[PDB]
């Protein structure tokens, strides 16, 4: 008895933060471009802190936002790398969740030493219908408490769908 | 040798000996800072009003 309080993937963001801006960054860009099917966006470093050779605005990371069935499919493909089991600590209090994989080549196209091997970061932002209320230009509102996504609801939805399970507290 | 630097002592008494004078209000004050577009048209309006009032003596 819940008309449209139906948890659904709002988006899935794939992220690869290379510590450098060299050819490795372009390689990671093409990696997370090929599976996403979209042009990704490089993320400039904001400081020059230490241990990374990063500097202000060096374009050290690359990420891509996927929605719809493509996001659902990339999620279901990245979940088998985790064997459809995730840590409870992976679930944010706002009802989102994520996981990290390594050796992206274990899906789709093989090693292809021209592109090399990369690890990737999967973050799934979960919402219900009516999330447009918070994002639209006009009459911007705040989703009500009963309608907010929670970790206690996202964990339950994540074991309902994908027939998965979670780990210790 | 140092000296006094400033004081307003006796200044109000000096000013009130001949008194603070209100600035003699006039009818028809000057149009100095008035908008020049308004003034340009006001000249024509006044010339026309003068001509009309002259002709109105028949």
């Amino acid at each position: 008895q819940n008309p449209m309080r139906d948890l659904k993937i709002e988006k899935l963001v794939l992220n690869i933060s290379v510590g450098e801006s060299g050819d490795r960054l372009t390689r990671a860009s093409k990696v997370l471009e090929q599976l996403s099917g979209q042009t990704p966006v490089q993320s400039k470093a904001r400081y020059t802190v230490r241990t990374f050779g990063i500097r202000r605005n060096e374009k050290i990371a690359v990420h891509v936002t996927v929605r719809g069935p493509k996001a659902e499919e990339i999620l279901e493909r990245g979940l088998k790398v985790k064997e459809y089991q995730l840590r409870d600590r992976n679930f944010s209090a706002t009802g989102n969740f994520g996981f990290g994989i390594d050796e992206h080549i274990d899906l789709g196209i093989k090693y292809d030493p021209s592109i090399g091997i990369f690890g990737m970061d999967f973050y799934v932002v979960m919402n219900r219908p009516g999330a447009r209320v918070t994002r639209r230009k006009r009459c911007k509102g705040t989703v009500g408490n009963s309608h907010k996504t929670t970790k206690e609801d996202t964990v339950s939805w994540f074991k309902q769908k994908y027939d998965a399970d979670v780990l210790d507290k | 040798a140092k000296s006094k630097n400033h004081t307003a002592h006796n200044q109000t008494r000096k000013a009130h000996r001949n008194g603070i004078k209100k600035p003699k209000t006039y009818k028809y004050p000057s149009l100095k800072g008035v908008d020049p577009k308004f003034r340009r048209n006001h000249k024509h309006a006044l010339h026309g009003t003068a001509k009309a009032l002259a002709a109105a003596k028949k």
Binding site: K137, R138, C139, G141 | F38
Partner: protein, 296 residues
């Protein structure tokens, strides 16, 4: 609540609330100041805004002026009035916006006695041209477009309503670089594409493309079109007839108002919770206190 909800007393005490219509996210006061503020050397001249709002299923087209007591509507036109002029589907599309602009323009000019003079663009070809002043005669009724918070894009329905009100004979200052058909690569607009949009050519082209593609989608969308037997090629003459009917009689017949305001109020007053009195609040507090004969 949490350590981040239920903000503290000092925060609540020092919070300055925005204007109510800024809290509601409805009025850009930065734009409203520049739309509404009049040259002080005119001393009474109302600045009229052609306010164009797009809700779901309805278009709001008003001509509004401002006063200290509040905005005053001069003439209003809605997209739910296009059925009277022979438009019953797509009541929020580009062509409906153009029709509503034409309707507000004709209605306002009639209200001001400027319908005969300033006929506007009666033979519309989709060309960029403003309502020109006639020689030895009153100037056209000037209104300034008010999008509100809707974005300025090339091809927006708000600029379709702008174009409709301009063609209707209202002087609405505007450029053409936001109309559909404007060639962003160059300095010119495609008048044939603008005319197509004015007459719903994009909607009818979609109708025929969807007919020659998956027919389930053409049965779901345009279901009312098939159930009213409206061919895609009939949209142009539908909009032509609508423009002619609008120019014929933009006189704003209002609805017949069944169940008059007294019974409207009486019916709505049943599903309305009333505020409790201070004695009722005291009784409720006393009841919650005395319910602890011991402690629950």
């Amino acid at each position: 609540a949490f350590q981040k909800d239920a903000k503290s007393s000092a925060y609540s005490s020092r919070f300055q609330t925005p204007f109510r219509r800024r809290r509601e996210g409805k009025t850009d006061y930065y734009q409203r100041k520049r739309l509404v503020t009049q040259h002080k050397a005119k001393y009474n001249t109302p600045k009229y805004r052609l306010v164009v709002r797009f809700t779901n299923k309805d278009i709001i087209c008003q001509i509004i002026s401002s006063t200290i007591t509040g905005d005053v509507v001069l003439a209003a036109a809605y997209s739910h009035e296009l059925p009277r002029y022979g438009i019953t589907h797509g009541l929020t599309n580009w062509a409906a916006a153009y029709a509503t602009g034409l309707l507000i323009a004709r209605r306002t000019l009639q209200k001001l006695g400027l319908d005969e003079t300033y006929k506007g663009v009666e033979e519309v070809e989709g060309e960029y041209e403003l309502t020109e002043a006639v020689e030895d005669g009153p100037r056209p009724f000037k209104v300034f477009l008010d999008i509100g918070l809707q974005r300025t894009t090339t091809g927006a329905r708000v600029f379709g309503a702008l174009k409709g009100a301009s063609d209707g004979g209202l002087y609405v200052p505007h450029s053409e670089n936001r109309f559909p058909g404007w060639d962003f690569e160059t300095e010119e607009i495609d008048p044939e594409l603008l005319r197509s949009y004015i007459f719903g050519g994009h909607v009818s082209q979609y109708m025929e493309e969807l007919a020659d593609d998956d027919e389930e989608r053409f049965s779901e969308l345009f279901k009312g079109y098939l159930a009213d037997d409206i061919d895609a090629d009939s949209l142009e003459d539908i909009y032509t007839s609508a423009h002619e009917a609008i120019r014929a009689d933009p006189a704003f017949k209002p609805t017949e108002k069944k169940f008059t305001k007294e019974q409207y109020a009486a019916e709505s007053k049943k599903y309305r919770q009333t505020k409790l009195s201070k004695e009722e609040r005291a009784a409720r507090v006393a009841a919650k206190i005395a319910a602890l004969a011991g402690q629950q």
